[PDB]
Amino acid sequence: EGTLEVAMEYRTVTGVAGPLVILDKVKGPKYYEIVNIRLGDGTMRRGQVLEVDGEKAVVQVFEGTSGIDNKFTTVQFTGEVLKTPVSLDMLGRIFNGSGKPIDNGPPILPEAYLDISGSSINPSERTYPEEMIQTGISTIDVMNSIARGQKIPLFSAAGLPHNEIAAQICRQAGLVKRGEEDNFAIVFAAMGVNMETAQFFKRDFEENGSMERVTLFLNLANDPTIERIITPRIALTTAEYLAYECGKHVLVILTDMSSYADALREVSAAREEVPGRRGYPGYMYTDLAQIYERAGRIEGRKGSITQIPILTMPNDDITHPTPDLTGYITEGQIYIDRQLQNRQIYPPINVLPSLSRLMKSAIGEGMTRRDHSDVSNQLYANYAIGKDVQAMKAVVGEEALSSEDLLYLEFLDKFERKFVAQGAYDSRNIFQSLDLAWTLLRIFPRELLHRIPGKTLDQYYSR
Amino acid sequence: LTLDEAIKTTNRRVNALENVVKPRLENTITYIKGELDELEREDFFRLKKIQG
Amino acid sequence: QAWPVRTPRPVSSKLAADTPLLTGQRVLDALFPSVLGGTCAIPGAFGCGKTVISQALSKYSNSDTVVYVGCGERGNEMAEVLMDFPQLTMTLPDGREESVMKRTTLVANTSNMPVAAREASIYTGITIAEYFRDMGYNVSMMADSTSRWAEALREISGRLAEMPADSGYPAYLAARLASFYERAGKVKCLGGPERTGSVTIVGAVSPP
Amino acid sequence: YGYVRKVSGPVVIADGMNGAAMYELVRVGHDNLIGEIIRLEGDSATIQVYEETAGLMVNDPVLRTHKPLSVELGPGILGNIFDGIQRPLKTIAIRSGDVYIPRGVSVPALDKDTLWEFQPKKIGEGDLLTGGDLYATVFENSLMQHHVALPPDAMGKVTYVAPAGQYSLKDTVLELEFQGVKKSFTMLQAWPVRTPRPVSSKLAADTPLLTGQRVLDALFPSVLGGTCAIPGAFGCGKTVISQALSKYSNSDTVVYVGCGERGNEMAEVLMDFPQLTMTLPDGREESVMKRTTLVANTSNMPVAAREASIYTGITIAEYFRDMGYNVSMMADSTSRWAEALREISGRLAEMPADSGYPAYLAARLASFYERAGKVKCLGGPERTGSVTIVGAVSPPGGDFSDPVTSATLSIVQVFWGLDKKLAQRKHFPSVNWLISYSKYSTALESFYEQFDPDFINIRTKAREVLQREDDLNEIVQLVGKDALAEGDKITLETAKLLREDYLAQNAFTPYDKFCPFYKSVWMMRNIIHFYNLANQAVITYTLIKHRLGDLFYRLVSQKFEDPAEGEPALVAKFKKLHEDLTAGFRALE
């Protein structure tokens, strides 16, 4: 084997500006080589070499440039890109943003060092998601369902209970069961969460007793802004190792993706890169791809990576660059409405903008019922007509609702009342909920229904 | 009859017209400041980089 | 053979297209028709999943050959294409039963693949379709998310510190996009017999 | 050693500073102009100088400090007045005599020649001590005893302990050796503003911030060590709430922090605090300044000092919490701080973000706000303090859409929402019940039920009544009070009584200047219980309204009672009134 070499330690640091540390007289640099910077005080922090030109090197330190002296700090070039020591033993533990074990436990004994930002899967070898998931919440499963390998985020403005919904989903996560070793292992990324939210996550996960199959990658808002960018990379790399290289299906969760967007914006503004819309970097689409575009099923392996991000519209606007690019990339949306929260509904899922682009394959005959697609389409389409009827009633009066419009208004009322609402710990099965969905569709006459054929639901029978 | 007509007009103005205009004002503000102002700084920043 | 990917394939003389593109969709072929040789463009804002129309058109067009060259698109769409095109089928006038995968090629690179390859994707797609046209067929393509090949432009213009024209895109964006789109059209090919193949560019532009 | 080379406005380039460190404060020129290092390109440095740089001379000396922007803590920190960059305004004025702030003042933050009474703990001369150990306490003044904590990042076996007596900060009150080398510590601790103070464990907040106002105490409670937000731009509500916090809040200390506001406004507030006086629960009369510290940086002050004032204040609050005291910070105008940050960013030519603020504005605001919380102390003996921030916001025109407002609402747990409409309608509390909220109620429910298990149910019923108040409002608006049912009329009347009797305070009146939580709880019980007891009887609304005149008067007076009688007497009176109202509602039914 090629003989090893001890990393060269330099002291030629010849410039500091912003978060970027300049070096000179570097002997044979390497792009994206991880360099750990030791200050004169002796404290150490990591960093990446962003731009390599000639014998120079423009390093981006992690813990901040503060305290770096141009004649007393030393930089050591490890000569290798960032690598996360993934291992099967990493399950049931908590790690910092960069991966420091923070559960008062010994560090990870790596089964293999794996580089973050792993290469893409050859789409010829890529396959298609073909199985539903039993998260434990009615409205997500019944309409705009989630497939074992499908990516889909949660759109929810600030202050909404989306964190509680994520915690409930993670604690109640399970297969359809229509096995425990390959059962759902949950990788729980936490980008830029509050300390109270962090303690809540830790306590809730420890309480459900599923610590044996859940990994927390916590990154608080106190941690450096650049260190938040590598947290999703590490989480997804560990998920890739667990799923493809070990077998068990992984249900990747990342909270506050808007925090990741803000971290990207801060890092880009630091280096003065070309800005896209709203001052975000012009390559944000590619970065959000490299984060999201890993969920899927690989042909030769029995693993599967399901992605459930959690975004937050900053101004409660769907047109914001982060949610817009996500919706471009994320293959569907599960939407949460503040207006429904104003009505004191615990799971404020609004179904009008919520669609799963892979639902057309999750449904079928192996699972669910043969009337799933048509019933979902009707409860998706008649809601818009009910909203239009409500608007007409608001702008004209109660007399505007004719013998047909009043039916749509009553449909909307009952749909928002009974169907959407669910218990904080209710595992409402599909058929029991689909019966009430059929009742809601049957509030309207069985002949005015245009899109659905009568025979489709007629195959199913009440009681 | 007159009260019904006036109430219809008032409700239409409150619901449709004002809520139509205000998003238009927000979009116009975003298009100017969010793009033109950002571009102007970026253009000048690139020019200063060229000079340096 | 071999051919530079930016230099268009030579022809005898381009000529007007006068045969409609039977997409099999009511709206596409009834109100807003397209001709076999013309250029289309579908905006399809976020959440619309405009690639469903793309796939339907590729499946059911009268075009002899389809080159789905989706650039920057999600890999699951390519998985769907590779899974369904063989199992899906079409019939020919001879009466036999055959798959559409026998005539469809994908030069697609996903969004997680490196950025700079996207322009190469687009150009290789158009050159392959040009070759199939010079064969004489009524070949067609549809480049999913050509707007991704503007992010590819500006993510390079930024490294070169080129002067930003509009929203960060370089100045030649319109020029290059025209140089790409202007390669469609019915044309009498070079040499006998008198092949009169065409090529269609059903692009997709995703706006922010 | 070190000479300037290029002076382009605020930006300054100084050569011969190879050993300089990033963000290390430096003294520039003979006038001792103070500026922070930004870029260390080459062997040269780059400094932005806070005060005006006009008149600098090339090759004028530059003197390093080997320390980032730091604050000298210790005895005497309370009571005084300090600038943004930790400059004692009072002593500067006394020493210079004149009024203007000299360009290049060098007065130390705390007088190092003044004497304070010192006495050590029972520690021995050869014992072992570590960082955060409380080895002595000092009577800086009466009733504000100051503990002397051994500085963090310092530990070792005890070598010398100063016996009790009169000493000054320049004296070496403590000396100890970890290794063979020995270090001697005085009573002055320096700590950088940017670096937070070391903590042992971030506890869960479990005690409400009793502000003395019923609306904040019961409707929208705030917990010790919890963030708070105020949309304060007019109506003097910010002044009122600040005075309430200074006088009646549970906090053992208050650290007001004013940045970039109107100079005359800071003059008014800094003349108001000395006039403010608070009585002790033991009957003693004190001055709020004896427990108050004030950091005021007006608009005339340098922009960098305006940005650093907030961090200075939060570091002072953390130092106070280091000895387990409950201390409350009050950021006067976070909007002004954000504008100062924007000006600094524009000076640095950083790439603009949303609405012109730099892209790190949200991140820096979150980093600042994350320092609040109930925290276990470092080092023994065991004790626990808290730091709660009640930093206000000034949205432009009241539109809660500016990035400062959005980030603050995203980070702050409890938003109280002062409304100018209530101020126009002559509302002393001015708290809009329709927009305020308290996200910490779920965590505070433990204490809420421990004090009274029915109090939380009463609060939920009051929230439901407030929600139905607007419903009855449009009901009266569209058809009038005639269509209201007897139960609906009773609910509307009870909501109006709650709004005009308990949800509103009288401040200026001696009887309602301070509202104890006991009186608040009894008032809430006497209101909600009466509301229900009248509700289930549906009885003609007119009849019960006529026959409950005495009950209505008792409910109204349930807040007119002064706190002079104390909790045992007022609680008994409220209980008797509630029993009488219940008897009148039940017997007449």
- Interface probe, candidates A120, A283, A286, A294, chain C, greatest C C-beta count within 10 A: A286
- Measured CA distances, C174 to A276, C41, C126, C144, D289 (Å): 18, 15, 17, 18, 69
Say yes or no for a CB contact (<8 Å) between C164 and B42.
yes
Per DSSP (E only), the strands in D401-511 are: 414-415, 437-438
Let me know: does C113 contact A124? Beta carbons within 8 Å: no
Which of D18, D19, D359 shows the shortest C-beta gap to A266?
D359
Binding residues of C for ATP: 44-51
Q: Which residues of A touch B24 (CB under 8 A)?
A: none
CA distance D554 to A42: 71
CA distance A217 to C57: 44
Q: Which residues contact A453 (CB under 8 A, 6 or more apart)?
A: A374
Chain D contacts to B (CB-CB under 8 A)? 349, 351-352, 354-356
Q: Residue for token digits 């360009």?
A: D103
CA distance D66 to A90: 43
Which of A123, A128, A353 shows the shortest C-beta gap to C110?
A123
Both structure tokens of A101: 């074990």
Both structure tokens of D140: 């800086």
Residue A432 burial (C-beta neighbours within 10 Å; 0-12, 13-18, 19+): exposed
Q: Does D237 appear as a known binding residue?
A: yes
The neighbouring-strand residues paired with D250 are none
What order of strands is seen across the sheet that includes strand A349-356? A94-95, A214-220, A186-193, A250-255, A305-311, A154-155, A332-336, A349-356
Residue A357 burial (C-beta neighbours within 10 Å; 0-12, 13-18, 19+): buried
Q: Is A15 in the D-facing interface, judged by CB distances under 8 Å?
A: yes
Q: Which residues contact D121 (CB under 8 A, 6 or more apart)?
A: D134, D135, D136, D137
- Measured CA distances, A114 to A29, A234, A240, A248, C166 (Å): 22, 10, 10, 18, 40
Please give the interface size between A and C, counted as residue pairs whose CB atoms are below 8 Å apart. Answer: 85
CA distance A141 to A134: 7
CA distance B44 to chain C (A): 10
- C-beta atoms surrounding D381 within 10 Å: 9
Q: Which residues of D touch A278 (CB under 8 A)?
A: 353-354
Strands A13-17 and A20-23: antiparallel
CA distance D187 to D185: 7
Chains touching B by CB (3 or more pairs below 8 Å): A, C, D
- C-beta atoms surrounding B12 within 10 Å: 14
Return the closest-CA partner of residue A220 out of A248, A188, A197: A197
Q: Which residues of C touch B49 (CB under 8 A)?
A: 161
Please give the interface size between A and B, counted as residue pairs whose CB atoms are below 8 Å apart. Answer: 22
Say yes or no for a CB contact (<8 Å) between B39 and C161.
no
Say yes or no for a CB contact (<8 Å) between A282 and C49.
no
Q: Which residue of B has its CA nearest to A278?
A: B34
- C-beta atoms surrounding A180 within 10 Å: 9
Chains touching C by CB (3 or more pairs below 8 Å): A, B
Total number of residues shown for chain D: 589
CA distance D411 to D205: 16
Residues 18-77 on D with a CB inside 8 Å of A are: 18-23, 38-43, 68
CA distance A246 to A89: 12
Q: Which residues contact D198 (CB under 8 A, 6 or more apart)?
A: D131, D132, D152, D153, D378
Phi, psi of C11 (to 5 degrees): -135, 175
- C-beta atoms surrounding D579 within 10 Å: 12
- C-beta atoms surrounding C100 within 10 Å: 19
Q: Which residues of B touch A51 (CB under 8 A)?
A: none
Let me know: does A84 contact A95? Beta carbons within 8 Å: no
Both structure tokens of C118: 């996207």
Q: Which residue of B has its CA nearest to A274?
A: B42
Q: Which residues of C touch A327 (CB under 8 A)?
A: 46-47
- Eight-state DSSP code of residue D413: S
Which of C80, C83, C112 shows the shortest C-beta gap to A120?
C112
Q: Which residues of B touch A279 (CB under 8 A)?
A: 34, 38
Please give the interface size between B and C, counted as residue pairs whose CB atoms are below 8 Å apart. Answer: 14
Say yes or no for a CB contact (<8 Å) between B15 and A272.
no
Phi, psi of D425 (to 5 degrees): -85, 20
CA distance D360 to chain A (A): 6
DSSP secondary structure string, A119-145?
PPP-TTTB-----BEE-S-HHHHHSS-
Alpha-carbon dihedral of residues C101, C102, C103, C106, nearest 10 degrees? Answer: 50
Q: Which residues of A touch C79 (CB under 8 A)?
A: 123, 126-128, 296
CA distance A277 to chain B (A): 7
CA distance D577 to A383: 52
Q: Which residues contact D368 (CB under 8 A, 6 or more apart)?
A: D310, D311, D314
Q: Which residue of A has its CA nearest to B23?
A: A317
Both structure tokens of A236: 């997804």
Return the closest-CA partner of residue D317 out of D220, D197, D152, D407: D197
CA distance D478 to D476: 6
Chains touching A by CB (3 or more pairs below 8 Å): B, C, D
Phi, psi of A55 (to 5 degrees): -100, 10
Total number of residues shown for chain C: 208
CA distance A94 to A189: 10
* CA A368 to mean position of chain CA atoms: 26
- C-beta atoms surrounding A425 within 10 Å: 9
What residue type is assigned to position C149 of the chain? W
Return the closest-CA partner of residue D443 out of D202, D205, D203, D201: D205
CA distance C78 to chain A (A): 6
CA distance B21 to chain A (A): 17
CA distance B51 to chain A (A): 16
- Eight-state DSSP code of residue C20: B
CA distance D138 to D77: 12
Let me know: does C68 contact C108? Beta carbons within 8 Å: yes
Furthest-apart CA pair in chain A: how many Å? 88
Which helix (H) or strand (E) is A13 found in, with range?
Answer: strand A13-17
Return the closest-CA partner of residue D191 out of D107, D345, D67: D67
CA distance B36 to B23: 19
Resolution, expressed in angstroms to one decimal: 3.9
CA distance D336 to D368: 15
* CA D462 to mean position of chain CA atoms: 28
Say yes or no for a CB contact (<8 Å) between C115 and A275.
no
DSSP secondary structure string, B6-50?
HHHHHHHIIIIIHHHHHHHHHHHHHHIIIIIIHHHHHHHHHHHHH
Both structure tokens of A345: 């509904």
Residue A185 burial (C-beta neighbours within 10 Å; 0-12, 13-18, 19+): buried
Alpha-helix residue ranges (DSSP H) falling in C43-172: 51-60, 75-87, 117-134, 148-157
3 state DSSP class of D35: strand
Both structure tokens of D171: 């004296």
- Measured CA distances, A384 to A337, A343, A408 (Å): 15, 19, 9
CA distance A313 to chain B (A): 16
Q: Within 13 Å of residue D334, how many CA atoms lie on the same side as its CB?
A: 32
Say yes or no for a CB contact (<8 Å) between B41 and D355.
no
What residue type is assigned to position D509 of the chain? T
Residue D362 burial (C-beta neighbours within 10 Å; 0-12, 13-18, 19+): buried
Say yes or no for a CB contact (<8 Å) between D401 and A315.
yes
Say yes or no for a CB contact (<8 Å) between D355 and B37.
no
Say yes or no for a CB contact (<8 Å) between A199 and D204.
yes
Q: Determine D/C contact with 3+ CB pairs under 8 A as the test.
A: no
Let me know: does D248 contact D514? Beta carbons within 8 Å: yes
Which of C163, C166, C167 shows the shortest C-beta gap to B46?
C163
Q: Residue for token digits 């120079």?
A: A56
CA distance A353 to A129: 22
Say yes or no for a CB contact (<8 Å) between C161 and B49.
yes
CA distance A24 to chain B (A): 19
Q: Is B18 in the A-facing interface, judged by CB distances under 8 Å?
A: no
Q: Residue for token digits 């603050």?
A: D408
Which helix (H) or strand (E) is D183 found in, with range?
Answer: strand D182-185
Say yes or no for a CB contact (<8 Å) between C167 and B39.
yes
CA distance D527 to D458: 9
Say yes or no for a CB contact (<8 Å) between A277 and C167.
yes
Alpha-carbon dihedral of residues D390, D396, D397, D402, nearest 10 degrees? Answer: -90
- Measured CA distances, A14 to A24, A27, A400, D21, D287 (Å): 6, 15, 76, 12, 55
CA distance D514 to A162: 39
Q: Which residues of C touch A275 (CB under 8 A)?
A: 168
Phi, psi of D306 (to 5 degrees): -65, -40
Binding residues of C: 44-51
Q: Which residues of A touch C78 (CB under 8 A)?
A: 123, 126
CA distance D358 to D380: 42
Return the closest-CA partner of residue D308 out of D252, D364, D267: D364
Say yes or no for a CB contact (<8 Å) between B35 and A277.
yes
Say yes or no for a CB contact (<8 Å) between A128 and C80.
yes
Which helix (H) or strand (E) is D27 found in, with range?
Answer: strand D25-28
Both structure tokens of A355: 């669609």
Q: Which residues of D410-441 are buried (b: 16+ CB within 10 A; e: fewer)?
A: bbbbbbbbbbeebbeeebbbbbbbeebebbbb
